[PDB]
Amino acid sequence: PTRFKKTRHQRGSTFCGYGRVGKHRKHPSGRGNAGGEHHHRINFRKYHPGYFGKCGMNHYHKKKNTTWKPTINLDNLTKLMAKDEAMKAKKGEALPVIDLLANGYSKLLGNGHLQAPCIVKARWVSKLADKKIRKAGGAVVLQA
Amino acid sequence: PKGNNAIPHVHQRKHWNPCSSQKGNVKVFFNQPAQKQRRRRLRLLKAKKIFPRP
Amino acid sequence: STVKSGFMLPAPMLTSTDVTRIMQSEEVRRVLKPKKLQPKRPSRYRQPTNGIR
Amino acid sequence: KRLLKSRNNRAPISLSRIAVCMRRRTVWLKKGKKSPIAVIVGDVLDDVRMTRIPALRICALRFSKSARERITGAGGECLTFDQLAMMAPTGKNTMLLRGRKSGRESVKHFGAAGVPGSHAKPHVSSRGKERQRSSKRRHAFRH
Amino acid sequence: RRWHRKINLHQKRFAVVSALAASSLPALVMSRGHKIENVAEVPLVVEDGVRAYEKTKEAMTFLKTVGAIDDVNRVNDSRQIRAGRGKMRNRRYVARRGPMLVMPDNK
Amino acid sequence: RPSVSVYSASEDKVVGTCSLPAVFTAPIRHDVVQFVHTNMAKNSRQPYAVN
Amino acid sequence: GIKCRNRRKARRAHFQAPSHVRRILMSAPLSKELRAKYNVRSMPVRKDDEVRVKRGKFKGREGRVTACYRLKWVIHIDKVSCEKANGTTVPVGVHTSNVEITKLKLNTRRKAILERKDRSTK
Amino acid sequence: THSTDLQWLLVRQNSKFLQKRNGIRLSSDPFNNNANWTKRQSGFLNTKAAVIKTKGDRILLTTKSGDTNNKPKLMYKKTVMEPGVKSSVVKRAVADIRPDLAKMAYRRARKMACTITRMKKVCAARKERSSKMHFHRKTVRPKR
RNA sequence: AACGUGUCGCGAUGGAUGACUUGGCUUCCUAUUUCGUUGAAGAACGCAGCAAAGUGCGAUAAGUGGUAUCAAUUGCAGAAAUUGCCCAAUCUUUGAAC
RNA sequence: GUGUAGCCCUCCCGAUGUAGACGUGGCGUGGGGGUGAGGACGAAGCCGAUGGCGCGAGCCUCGGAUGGACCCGCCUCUAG
RNA sequence: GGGGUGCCCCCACCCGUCUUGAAACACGGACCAAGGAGUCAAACAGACGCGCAAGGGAGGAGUAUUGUGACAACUCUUUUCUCGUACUGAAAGGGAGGUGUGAUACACCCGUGGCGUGCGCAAUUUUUUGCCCAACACCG
RNA sequence: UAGGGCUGGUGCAGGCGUGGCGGAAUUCAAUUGCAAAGCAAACCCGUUGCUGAACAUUACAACCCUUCAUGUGAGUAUUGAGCCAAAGAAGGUGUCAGCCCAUUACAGCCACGGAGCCUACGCGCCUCCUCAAGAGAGUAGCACUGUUUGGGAAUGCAGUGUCAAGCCGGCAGGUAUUUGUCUGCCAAGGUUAAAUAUAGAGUAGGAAGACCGAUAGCGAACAAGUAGCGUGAGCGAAAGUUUGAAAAGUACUUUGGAAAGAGAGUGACAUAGAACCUGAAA
Ligand SMILES: [K+]
Ligand SMILES: [K+]
Ligand SMILES: [Mg+2]
Ligand SMILES: [Mg+2]
Ligand SMILES: [Mg+2]
Ligand SMILES: [Mg+2]
Ligand SMILES: [Mg+2]
Ligand SMILES: [Mg+2]
Ligand SMILES: [Mg+2]
Ligand SMILES: [Mg+2]
Ligand SMILES: [Mg+2]
Ligand SMILES: [Mg+2]
Ligand SMILES: [Mg+2]
Ligand SMILES: [Mg+2]
Ligand SMILES: [Mg+2]
Ligand SMILES: [Mg+2]
Ligand SMILES: [Mg+2]
Ligand code: NA
Ligand code: NA
Ligand code: NA
Fold it and tell me: Is A110 assigned to a binding site?
């Protein structure tokens, strides 16, 4: 709203906070990102060190649907189980079956302490995740 | 004085804004609720005419 | 609710909004610091300040 | 004093941190003593990584719905600040806690990313345009 | 110019709930400006038979019976010509807000 | 749970009772109402401009 | 239907009305005796009618209608006049909504209009 | 259940009973003694209240008990005092309901007694003057 | 002394202010909706009882014909139709102009 | 009970300032949503050796041997 | 007490501006009325208000309505898209809990990796100790 | 046997269109300065009680006092009684109007309707009609030059030169070359509704607005693209007729050549007297 701006407070100050010296002129120091290596060098080097230059190979016609691969950790698996099924899963009894694809996940990682044994269906899996889920009493079923 | 800001890439260097010398290049959606009513009315009319076809 | 998807009434921040009752309850008044005696009101005949004369 | 602070200065706490702190203190209790009450001037949020807690008594400004179910399901109790002022005036047998604020994204951007020994995160608009070779990177440590 | 606004869905439902709970407190109703000195109880609940009315005279008799006619009289007297340029732009008359009657449907 | 009486439309008489809904005991946040009302009332405006 | 929510539109249509529209606009109520005899609330005013003034300076006066000045939204009644400086008497206009009709001039067309305006059952 | 503490916070800044004229905050509350917009004086908001007024040449006391506070037509009860009632009697009646208004009640009751006496004297003097007058027209309201 | 200066009452000069608004600007919708050699768009000259501009019309020239409505037009004449809509017609010299 | 016509009563310490920053239940103008009034027994506007209030922006009363139909207080929204 | 007009004694360089420095022999300045200059959009950041929270939020569309109707209401195998819960390498690719015991190892799961300084609470006695939240330093 | 109203002919129905007509209830009762005004402090009492600081035989009208004459426009205002509402809607009428006027509806009624469109592809009759090969050649491709694209050892196109294949074909598969597989398609001829635009267009109509309010808003609220300017292409204003409810727009006497002045008269007001509301500052 226009009634909260500084211009309302400055009615009668004659300079609006820009000074008698210096004044408010149009485009000193240039327009846009001009002078990135002349007279604006210190700002660019201090705050954006990796701006000027190249790095790495190129990839023409990138299709991001081919590289889709979300990940979930072993310690967040109970967020996908039924609200009841957890807390009564044991070692050698019937266990819930979790499908990662239906929930929008591709790879299973192995961070943290597993809270309940289960059977997990996944596309990819890490070596540590496979070891931990087997020790707990569960299993991993590969799916495409 | 510029401080620690992101480097801007706002992409607004063509004559898109209508002024005293430019026609401009813009699109607005003030007809959105009216067109919503029109499409529903046409669907209801078509259903009445082709009855009882789905 | 059955008409709005997964909507429930928000929980209150205070279990009892009557704050004046709490301030004047017996449980609170037990642990309040005791009152102290205050001096007499100053009379006329302004007090002296010259400690020598 | 804490009730007057702004939202950014009243950080939320997780249920897992409360349970860990309670267990560390309660294990030293002498025979015939009750666990204290956890007090936080802020919000309490659920943690899916713990799933197993004892019966805790917590007083807070606000509880998330999933947090309230987990506490009550374990046998605990959610309290309000007006209830606390009645059961325990002067704050006897209470444990005062605060949330974490050093992990925020804003804190990661404090400083300059180009000075040696900084490890600050730059304000990057275009991620592709700010990529540096492994050499020419600034020095990582300074005394 | 940005004429319209977006509001979170949960915040919109929060406001409606709060404004409904305020209508059950007779002190807040009087403070807003309504005349409810003859109303039997708050909130006011009446029988379903008011939906079968067909003549305006029956509705007026029902309003006088439940004591809601004082508020509608207050709105009637407050009608007046608007001050300023607004009367030149199809806003010639102004009036106050009276009671609101809630029905299960639009019939 | 409190009860609410139902009054007849033709005479001063109670013709039934009903239980008070839970929506009437919810918190009253006049600051939320004011914020939502201010932004909602902007949605019916028509645009104006000069040539 | 001149009246609408657009005040600018409603006033433009009224003050630019054609002659046949103006005839309907200048109508007057009927007297109680005529109302009981025809079951018609009001009729447009025509020449050679007899009217009685109910509002203004000439309150209570009666006379015959001598002119229907549609260009000026008034009617001229005999014996309702004013004296000029030199002694000439000139008619004074009266708005048709300030008078009431006492006697009607009737022809075949007028009787047909009254019949079609009658509010009766069957 | 919403207490009067919350209700006062809602109406303190904006109410139909609050009159802010020339920087002065008074109140047009019908159940307010001395018309101060301070709470503890606003009887329309407190669960219990009592106000003192006059009806003809008698003191009229209106009281609001805590019971039936959701029925507007049964909230207030009227009481007419005996002629020439001592102000201490009125003070005791109010103190039985709102003990934190006892001294205010006594002053208000004394003011009402003075007002009733002055109203009688001024009306008698005006009637005397009108008897000697002569008037051009008198209006009589038709019966029924 | 006069000239000159100042205050109050009244009067000149001037056209601000307020209240008015058949105008402008902006957005939305609905059609049996899109000109011309069967001579268009534009341009010129004329036509009324009194008629300069403007409006309408074209030597059938502030209009002829049909239809609905139902007594006016109005500054003065003059008579004893007017208004809305539209099929049938008239349509001066030019202009793509052949 | 930050902020007032400050809830009230005592006591102590500072008070100038260009460029500049910030605060104010700080003043004023056109229009929207609410609430409460005023007007032919005279609205807006205009005039003044008309006084009163506020540190101030300003607000209010009085008179008109002026005017002839609309307009304002308070809470909020908005800006050519 | 206020207001108006004189008078006496005393005091008192012309405003705005650039400038180290203006009463300046530095520039703009005859008078009055009405106009007259930090606005709108889009990306990002920080402070402050509000809702929800390991999740948050849609858009476009659709479903039901002369009614304050270009408003308001509804749209859930767990949204159909987006930001976030995980980062790292030029890339192929890979991807993070604790304690105890041994030299994709084995066994357990009420749990701060350790040390230092650390609000408050708890325990002793006319002081000392315990748990330490947030935050900071050092070593794994 | 059956069809085709889009084979043709000849007839017969309804809708779309245009114009008009039709809806309730007070000009109720009390004045012409001063009671056509009030009080009885939430609601009720109240359909009831009580009156006058503008009248001491009338207040007010300019240095003070006395005397004599002059002065209040129009009831949509106030008060008390009613009435209508499937209608409370916002325009007009000498002040603020549901009941003075015009309007406000089909939960409708009439006239005209040549062609066209829509309806068991509306419905009868007569006529007619019906039920082994190949696949686009100065083309595609290639070279040089130019331009264009995010297209990068060359995305599309143009000029000239050169110029195919089809008994193991051709084009595409985003890093150049040769060779071999796999996948998807089959250029070099043509037609085609709907969902989309109207960023200084038109013809008829509607809905409006937190917009401007006569130095503003279009240049133009008015005989405005006009008057006026320039050889010309072109440029381009100012200006609310806003007196009054109604012209009732000042007869007549007198001075004056006239213009006008002094009286008189109309109007509630003429310091509302004619480009006439209000009428500021210098
Ligand atoms: K009338
Ligand atoms: K070729
Ligand atoms: Mg500078
Ligand atoms: Mg410099
Ligand atoms: Mg469109
Ligand atoms: Mg020729
Ligand atoms: Mg200072
Ligand atoms: Mg300064
Ligand atoms: Mg404006
Ligand atoms: Mg401006
Ligand atoms: Mg110098
Ligand atoms: Mg100077
Ligand atoms: Mg000098
Ligand atoms: Mg081919
Ligand atoms: Mg084509
Ligand atoms: Mg103009
Ligand atoms: Mg004038
Ligand atoms: Na200089
Ligand atoms: Na200069
Ligand atoms: Na102009």
Answer: no
